[PDB]
Every structure is written in C-alpha cells, then in structure tokens.
Amino acid sequence: NIHELWALTRIEQGWTYGPVRDDNKRLHPCLVNFHSLPEPERNYNLQMSGETLKTLLALGCHVGMADEKAYMMSNGYKPAPLDLSHVRLTPAQTTLVDRLAENGHNVWARDRVAQRRNPRLVPYRLLDEATKRSNRDSLCQAVRTLLGYGYNIEPRVRIFRAEKSYTVQSGRWYFEFEAV
C-alpha cells in the first residue's frame, strides 16, 4: 500500500511501467506488484518504510491496532485503494513521521557524504524547507495508510540595564521598550 504510493504516485510523474531503468525511458521495471520483482529491489520501497515502522515503534507512539487494518488510466499496473485515501490525521503524527524522515535521510547521509559536496550534507532539522516536503509527503502517506489501519501515532543569558548614575530615587517615572 506504500508501494502503491510509488505504483500510484511516482507513475503520476509522467512515468510508465516496463523494464528500462533510466529517466530518458520515462519507465521503471519495479512499478508493479512486490510479489513479482524481488523484495530487495522492491525493498527500495518497502524496506525503508519498514525501518520507518520499526522506528515508529521506537518513538513510543501509540501504534496499537484498532478495527480492521492494512482514477486516471495509467499504463501498466493500476492499484485502486479502498477506504484509505480519505483518512485524516492529528498534526503530531506528521512531526513523528518527519523525525522518521530525518533519521532515514541521515542514515542515508552516512554514505552520500562519503561520496562530492552533496546538497543534502545537512540533517533534516536544518535543511531548507522546500526539501522538507520531499520526505514529508511520503511520510504523510504512510500516516494515511497507518491511520487508515486505525493506528494512532502520539507519545547563556544576556541582560541589559541602565547606568547607576541615572537611577531614580524619587517621584513618578516611566520608561519604554519596543520588541523586535
């Protein structure tokens, strides 16, 4: 179902099903059932989500089960998900998923930094806001499938003062401060 956000999401970006692994082909062989292509190359999809789930378990979030749990004519395989697309979510869960995106992007960063000055040298907390969305979207879809499983996902100092000479020991007085 998360592979569906790849078999019915990455395909939406002009991509087509079929065996030719290059952007010029506008096509990708694994854009199909995980039962067909091996679950290593398909682990490029399912496995990182699985680590995202082990990590969602690691967060102490209320992942405990509730209830039952689990269109333009695109070429190739055409998944048609039932009652998951409408699913709503509390804001904190997006933060947890964003943390998961941080952890995965950084564990990814252990190798890329070894290879030049990659644009994403940085941890997710300090990376540019436009790059938040790239992982945050895939994270939020995971939030959609999981909440559609009925799952929940929740758990120096400066000082500035006047000269003593100006101090006032008598009378009505008043001073002012603007906050930047």
UniProtKB/Swiss-Prot annotation:
It is found in: Sarcoplasmic reticulum membrane. Sequence repeats lie at residues 1-70, 71-155. Detected in skeletal muscle (at protein level). Fast- or slow-twitch skeletal muscle. The N-terminus is blocked. Binding of [3H]ryanodine indicates that the heterozygous channel is activated by Ca(2+) concentrations 4-fold lower than normal. Single-cell analysis of cotransfected cells shows a significantly increased resting cytoplasmic Ca(2+) level and a significantly reduced luminal Ca(2+) level. Belongs to the ryanodine receptor (TC 1.A.3.1) family. RYR1 subfamily. Cytosolic calcium-activated calcium channel that mediates the release of Ca(2+) from the sarcoplasmic reticulum into the cytosol and thereby plays a key role in triggering muscle contraction following depolarization of T-tubules. Repeated very high-level exercise increases the open probability of the channel and leads to Ca(2+) leaking into the cytoplasm. Can also mediate the release of Ca(2+) from intracellular stores in neurons, and may thereby promote prolonged Ca(2+) signaling in the brain. Required for normal embryonic development of muscle fibers and skeletal muscle. This is Ryanodine receptor 1. It comes from Oryctolagus cuniculus (Rabbit). The gene is RYR1. The chain holds residues 877 to 1095 of 5037 of the full protein.
